[PDB]
């Protein structure tokens, strides 16, 4: 079934010490989240650049890692029910806060953790290049050759287009119908590895370290080993849901060229351009497209999705 | 009277070429906006850093300009009626679009231009250190020594704390009452040069280059001298107003130390901490505090403000 | 069905500034061409070298990019009807001319844009190495394993042999019959990714910036933002068709070794050599073979071709 | 059938001279062992690093080869009957001892050669990327597409997780049941190339150069060409079997990322975590996971395994 998605967002200094603590702390956080039975997996991204759209963002490029002073992370966690995420955070607060707190020395902005429902998904299981022979064999044995997916390689060996959209109030239905039509046509592009549409349903205060006054002072005053009152979150997840409605259109690609010209198909192929024009007519903000590298992931979230 | 405020936000490459075109294009844009009789001035900022809040944002410091790969600009324009801003853009579209278009090669994100109402303002006219003798003389001659302001130096010789807040729906009145009480007490801090509270009323589609499909293609395809159809904006300013409600708390200071410890008074002075805790209890997001340098400005906006 | 092909040819300085504007202007031109419903895609090439034929062109080699002072571009655009190309140019002249005009500082020769009919095509859809599992699955599901193509990777991950021929008047039928026989046999060579034969039907005056006196002076005198009169083109496309008849034999290959020895099959394999000798007997000029890298492309032109 | 496994372990100086004599002497030893008809193959490993488990072993990383002063070897030889191994050593002692003796100048610890029975095996034949077409063709021809394996590339082109476990006396049955359930689920991870569980049955005294007093002095006093009395080994293989019972869990992976996150599946996937927790409850020591590179191997041992 379709899981819910929490996306933890933050911006940190682009330096070795940051990536070192990614390697130490990251696995720990993931292991703690896996204590909850509603946890079905994760996909953690580093932003490597921004899609320039010709020279609309002429200062950007798809890979800005060698020049950027900061690094943005987007950590997806997947949940059977979005309430599982909230429960997991509270049940494991002593660990999560202290783990996430150790990132402080590198932090510039965040954490900020919106919650999403998946309203459309065409996402395959991941496989390594070593796997495809056994997959093909099994699918033919089952008489289901149509269920043979593309090869979507895990652990940093593909790229993601993270397209931000906010929609004019009242035009949500038009956006959702048109974007699904768009993605159904987009899958013809070479190197297309899957797409899903995420619709924000709210924000996790606790995941964003957004407390009332009491928790705010505890966060600021913390020596590192004393958690804020997790009960001092002043709003529920849906209470923080944004209007204009926010969506993420998440599209995966074999490589950044396939991404650039593949996403470009909505501009370059007249038949698809006409369909995607219906998406553009609904927007308050966007499309703004971040280029992401899915480096650390628990690939079994796609097994839950596709069962 | 209180003007409305448009704030044009963008992120550009932090390099000499960016600042060179600031010097060339900036004045032109300002001269064009001054064509509209509703224009009462401007205050253009560069972000120089982020308030770290101890080590809450331990990767940040108040002046990150020497290390940052990007520069964020926040360009305030002041208007008798916010509709003046929208009309100005449309009436002078051929000039403005082609001027702002020349920034493309340096752009990474933006432009994004929310519109605000001022719900509280305690902001003096600017004066240079050369002016204060005449100001003192004039005010005593008129029998109005209470009207002698602090010395708030224009053109990059003071700093701004730009504090972002979003508020839980239903708590706006609690937020506004408490933040005004806070700022009324905050003005006692040494080096305090004024404060105002900005409340978002919407977003300018045209100022944000956010069009329907037609305008979107015209923007991407533009050689530099062909404006998109300005009539292709699909939403009004109020249709894009965010819920949760967004506020900017804008506080000006003599220098970055006075800023750090002055803003810090809301944490460090128990009486004020109690008042400001009422603000904290209302928030979905924030406070997130950007450190700004007001470099280019038309100081007469404060003359309109203070009559 | 078979589309018509326009090939825009130009020679520019081989330096970073040229490739930077390829990246800036290129996408824009492509987005503009896609405004016309008869546009079915594109394939843009950079020449990387010349096939030396042993030492017939002993000063040449297949990759001369590190030593050449110039770079030649060959930009294919594909059209349902060749008149669509002409119509597109005229309808979008203000954008196209200003876009192409910005290349001026790097230009040494061109643009020159002959138009071609395709008289033979054996060209597969492009696929990334990630795609083939799904393609195989789909074709077996449909009971059409013979329709499983070779893997022809898009976006610079294969190479093209661009073979220029001009034919003795009266020998066109012999050339065409023999070259098709040749290519039908050539497809047995390892790493063969497809072939097509293009027959010139004329030249686009507007795409070649070839006007009468009025337009000529407008081009020379242009500050960059004032298009020449597009009605000052003095000849129709067929009026410029060359006699001797010109052809392009366009053959795609996995890599430059497969290209060299694969094309060489028409000299090295006695049975194929006898067939290809019938081609050679018809020539006024050629074969002259440019080595091309297809870097930027709209791969959906092959979907139109093979539907 | 399942062969028995002898694993020769040693630690040597990490320098070119060590690898040079690996290349000279290594093949010789393998040729001598192949004199015995019970020999069914071998898989020789170099340890390239240690799995850090987040920062549990924070001084370790998966590839420590550029920094380490030593290199550990683990040389698997496979035998129809474990007694064949003992027989081979004694029958060919003059060659083996003089061959292994030439390693002396580089040795820091070892040799130590435990013997194991395989209690679980899910291990495919090796294939190069060049082979899979013919493999697929053959299996479909035989009507057995389910017997198409993953591509497990020989000769250094994959990696091994070498997981050491020792089990509480009385808990061997629980360990063995749980670890098999674990590995049966683990095979779902991307890039999983096979697994087996080795259970120690004893230690080869002769393979470990562990003699009585007489042989000890002969070893120490040897000029290089005088073997110790091979009959002076004072214990049989089973007499040296350890309690607590020792196991090796041997898992092969496409690459070190697939290894890290794949092995990590027993921590990150809740369903598998519950199963694997039953393994953890039985342990005296471990899991300690060495990262191995299978460089030199006789791949036909897997043909014997899978018949
Ligand atoms: Fe979370
Ligand atoms: Fe504006
Ligand atoms: Fe053209
Ligand atoms: Fe041995």
Coordinates of N, CA and C in Angstrom, one line a residue, chain D residues 183-285:
Chain D
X183 N 18.8 -15.3 7.1 CA 19.5 -15.2 5.8 C 18.5 -15.5 4.6
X184 N 17.4 -16.2 4.9 CA 16.4 -16.5 4.0 C 15.6 -15.2 3.6
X185 N 15.5 -14.3 4.6 CA 14.9 -13.0 4.4 C 15.8 -12.0 3.9
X186 N 17.1 -12.2 4.2 CA 18.1 -11.2 3.9 C 18.3 -11.2 2.3
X187 N 18.0 -12.3 1.7 CA 18.3 -12.4 0.3 C 17.5 -11.5 -0.6
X188 N 16.5 -10.8 0.0 CA 15.7 -9.8 -0.6 C 16.5 -8.5 -0.9
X189 N 17.5 -8.2 -0.1 CA 18.3 -7.0 -0.2 C 18.9 -6.9 -1.6
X190 N 18.9 -5.6 -2.1 CA 19.6 -5.4 -3.4 C 21.1 -5.8 -3.4
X191 N 21.6 -6.4 -4.4 CA 23.0 -6.7 -4.5 C 23.5 -7.9 -3.6
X192 N 22.5 -8.6 -3.0 CA 22.8 -9.8 -2.3 C 23.3 -10.9 -3.3
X193 N 24.4 -11.5 -3.0 CA 25.0 -12.5 -3.9 C 25.1 -13.9 -3.4
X194 N 24.6 -14.1 -2.2 CA 24.6 -15.4 -1.6 C 25.1 -15.4 -0.1
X195 N 24.8 -16.4 0.6 CA 25.2 -16.6 2.0 C 25.4 -18.0 2.4
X196 N 26.3 -18.2 3.3 CA 26.5 -19.5 4.0 C 26.9 -19.4 5.4
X197 N 26.5 -20.4 6.2 CA 26.9 -20.5 7.6 C 27.9 -21.6 7.8
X198 N 29.0 -21.2 8.4 CA 30.1 -22.2 8.7 C 30.1 -22.5 10.2
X199 N 30.1 -23.7 10.5 CA 30.2 -24.2 11.9 C 31.5 -24.9 12.2
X200 N 32.3 -24.4 13.1 CA 33.6 -24.9 13.4 C 33.5 -26.4 13.9
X201 N 34.3 -27.3 13.3 CA 34.3 -28.7 13.8 C 35.6 -29.0 14.4
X202 N 36.6 -28.1 14.3 CA 37.9 -28.3 14.9 C 38.9 -27.4 14.3
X203 N 40.2 -27.8 14.5 CA 41.3 -27.0 14.0 C 42.4 -27.9 13.5
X204 N 43.0 -27.6 12.3 CA 44.1 -28.4 11.8 C 45.4 -28.0 12.4
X205 N 45.9 -28.8 13.3 CA 47.2 -28.6 13.9 C 48.3 -28.4 12.8
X206 N 48.3 -29.3 11.8 CA 49.4 -29.2 10.8 C 49.2 -28.0 10.0
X207 N 48.0 -27.6 9.6 CA 47.8 -26.3 8.9 C 48.1 -25.1 9.7
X208 N 48.1 -25.2 11.0 CA 48.4 -24.1 11.9 C 49.8 -24.1 12.4
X209 N 50.6 -25.1 11.9 CA 52.0 -25.2 12.3 C 52.1 -25.4 13.8
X210 N 51.1 -26.1 14.4 CA 51.1 -26.3 15.8 C 51.5 -27.8 16.1
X211 N 52.7 -28.0 16.4 CA 53.3 -29.3 16.7 C 53.5 -29.5 18.1
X212 N 54.0 -30.7 18.5 CA 54.5 -30.9 19.8 C 55.9 -30.2 19.9
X213 N 56.6 -30.5 21.0 CA 58.0 -29.9 21.2 C 58.9 -30.2 20.1
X214 N 59.0 -31.4 19.6 CA 59.9 -31.7 18.5 C 59.7 -30.8 17.3
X215 N 58.4 -30.8 16.8 CA 58.1 -30.0 15.6 C 58.3 -28.5 15.8
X216 N 58.0 -28.0 17.0 CA 58.1 -26.6 17.3 C 59.6 -26.2 17.1
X217 N 60.5 -27.0 17.7 CA 61.9 -26.7 17.5 C 62.4 -26.7 16.0
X218 N 61.8 -27.7 15.3 CA 62.1 -27.9 13.8 C 61.6 -26.6 13.1
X219 N 60.4 -26.2 13.4 CA 59.9 -25.0 12.8 C 60.8 -23.8 13.0
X220 N 61.2 -23.5 14.3 CA 62.0 -22.4 14.7 C 63.4 -22.5 14.1
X221 N 63.9 -23.7 14.0 CA 65.3 -23.9 13.5 C 65.5 -24.0 12.0
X222 N 64.3 -24.1 11.3 CA 64.4 -24.4 9.9 C 65.1 -23.3 9.0
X223 N 66.1 -23.8 8.2 CA 66.7 -22.9 7.3 C 65.8 -22.7 6.0
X224 N 64.8 -23.4 5.9 CA 63.8 -23.2 4.8 C 63.5 -24.5 4.0
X225 N 64.5 -25.5 4.1 CA 64.3 -26.7 3.3 C 64.2 -28.0 4.1
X226 N 63.9 -27.8 5.4 CA 63.8 -29.0 6.2 C 62.4 -29.0 7.0
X227 N 61.5 -29.8 6.5 CA 60.2 -29.9 7.1 C 60.2 -30.5 8.5
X228 N 59.3 -29.9 9.4 CA 59.1 -30.6 10.7 C 58.4 -31.9 10.5
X229 N 58.5 -32.8 11.4 CA 57.8 -34.1 11.4 C 56.3 -33.9 11.4
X230 N 55.6 -34.1 10.3 CA 54.2 -33.9 10.2 C 53.4 -34.8 11.2
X231 N 54.0 -35.8 11.6 CA 53.4 -36.8 12.6 C 53.5 -36.3 14.0
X232 N 54.1 -35.1 14.2 CA 54.3 -34.6 15.6 C 53.2 -33.7 16.0
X233 N 52.1 -33.7 15.2 CA 50.9 -32.9 15.6 C 50.2 -33.7 16.8
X234 N 50.0 -33.1 17.9 CA 49.6 -33.8 19.1 C 48.1 -33.9 19.3
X235 N 47.3 -33.2 18.4 CA 45.9 -33.3 18.5 C 45.1 -33.5 17.2
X236 N 44.0 -34.2 17.3 CA 43.2 -34.4 16.1 C 42.4 -33.1 15.8
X237 N 41.8 -33.0 14.6 CA 41.0 -31.8 14.3 C 39.9 -31.6 15.4
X238 N 39.0 -32.6 15.7 CA 37.9 -32.3 16.6 C 38.4 -32.0 18.1
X239 N 39.5 -32.5 18.5 CA 40.0 -32.2 19.8 C 40.2 -30.7 20.1
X240 N 40.4 -29.9 19.0 CA 40.6 -28.5 19.2 C 39.4 -27.7 18.9
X241 N 38.2 -28.3 18.7 CA 37.0 -27.6 18.5 C 36.6 -26.7 19.7
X242 N 36.3 -25.4 19.5 CA 36.1 -24.5 20.6 C 34.7 -24.7 21.1
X243 N 34.6 -24.5 22.5 CA 33.3 -24.2 23.2 C 33.7 -23.0 24.0
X244 N 32.9 -21.9 23.9 CA 31.7 -21.7 23.0 C 31.8 -22.0 21.5
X245 N 30.8 -22.6 21.0 CA 30.7 -22.9 19.6 C 31.0 -21.7 18.7
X246 N 31.9 -21.8 17.8 CA 32.1 -20.7 16.8 C 31.4 -20.9 15.5
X247 N 30.9 -19.8 14.9 CA 30.3 -19.8 13.6 C 30.8 -18.7 12.8
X248 N 30.9 -18.9 11.5 CA 31.1 -17.8 10.5 C 29.8 -17.6 9.7
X249 N 29.3 -16.4 9.7 CA 28.2 -16.1 8.7 C 28.8 -15.3 7.6
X250 N 28.8 -16.0 6.4 CA 29.5 -15.5 5.2 C 28.5 -15.0 4.2
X251 N 28.5 -13.7 4.0 CA 27.5 -13.1 3.0 C 28.2 -12.3 2.0
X252 N 27.8 -12.5 0.7 CA 28.5 -11.8 -0.4 C 27.6 -10.7 -1.0
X253 N 28.2 -9.7 -1.5 CA 27.5 -8.5 -1.9 C 28.2 -7.8 -3.1
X254 N 27.3 -7.2 -3.9 CA 27.8 -6.6 -5.2 C 28.8 -5.5 -4.9
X255 N 28.8 -4.8 -3.8 CA 29.7 -3.7 -3.5 C 29.6 -3.4 -2.0
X256 N 30.5 -2.5 -1.5 CA 30.5 -2.2 -0.1 C 29.2 -1.4 0.4
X257 N 28.6 -0.6 -0.4 CA 27.4 0.1 -0.1 C 26.3 -1.0 0.1
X258 N 26.1 -1.9 -0.9 CA 25.1 -2.9 -0.8 C 25.4 -3.8 0.5
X259 N 26.6 -4.0 0.8 CA 27.0 -4.8 2.0 C 26.5 -4.0 3.2
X260 N 26.9 -2.7 3.3 CA 26.6 -2.0 4.5 C 25.1 -1.9 4.8
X261 N 24.3 -1.5 3.8 CA 22.9 -1.3 3.9 C 22.1 -2.6 3.9
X262 N 22.7 -3.5 3.1 CA 22.1 -4.8 3.1 C 22.2 -5.6 4.4
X263 N 23.4 -5.8 4.9 CA 23.5 -6.3 6.2 C 22.7 -5.5 7.2
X264 N 22.7 -4.2 7.0 CA 21.9 -3.3 7.9 C 20.4 -3.6 7.9
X265 N 19.9 -4.3 6.9 CA 18.5 -4.7 6.8 C 18.0 -5.4 8.1
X266 N 18.9 -6.2 8.7 CA 18.6 -6.9 9.9 C 18.4 -5.9 11.1
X267 N 18.8 -4.7 10.9 CA 18.6 -3.7 12.0 C 17.5 -2.7 11.6
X268 N 17.3 -2.5 10.3 CA 16.4 -1.4 9.8 C 15.0 -1.8 9.3
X269 N 14.9 -3.1 9.0 CA 13.6 -3.6 8.6 C 12.9 -4.3 9.7
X270 N 11.8 -3.7 10.3 CA 11.3 -4.2 11.6 C 11.0 -5.7 11.6
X271 N 10.4 -6.3 10.5 CA 10.1 -7.7 10.5 C 11.4 -8.5 10.6
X272 N 12.4 -8.1 9.9 CA 13.7 -8.9 9.9 C 14.4 -8.6 11.2
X273 N 14.3 -7.4 11.7 CA 14.9 -7.1 13.0 C 14.4 -8.0 14.1
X274 N 13.1 -8.3 14.1 CA 12.6 -9.2 15.1 C 13.2 -10.6 15.0
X275 N 13.3 -11.1 13.8 CA 13.9 -12.4 13.5 C 15.4 -12.5 14.0
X276 N 16.1 -11.5 13.5 CA 17.5 -11.4 13.8 C 17.8 -11.2 15.3
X277 N 16.9 -10.6 16.0 CA 17.0 -10.4 17.5 C 17.2 -11.8 18.2
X278 N 16.6 -12.8 17.6 CA 16.7 -14.2 18.2 C 18.2 -14.7 18.0
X279 N 18.9 -14.3 17.0 CA 20.3 -14.6 16.8 C 21.1 -13.9 17.9
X280 N 20.9 -12.6 18.1 CA 21.7 -11.8 19.0 C 21.6 -12.3 20.4
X281 N 20.4 -12.8 20.8 CA 20.2 -13.3 22.2 C 21.0 -14.5 22.5
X282 N 21.6 -15.2 21.5 CA 22.4 -16.4 21.8 C 23.9 -16.2 21.9
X283 N 24.4 -15.0 21.7 CA 25.8 -14.8 21.4 C 26.6 -14.6 22.7
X284 N 27.8 -15.2 22.7 CA 28.9 -14.8 23.6 C 29.7 -13.7 23.0
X285 N 30.1 -13.9 21.8 CA 30.9 -12.9 21.1 C 30.3 -12.6 19.7

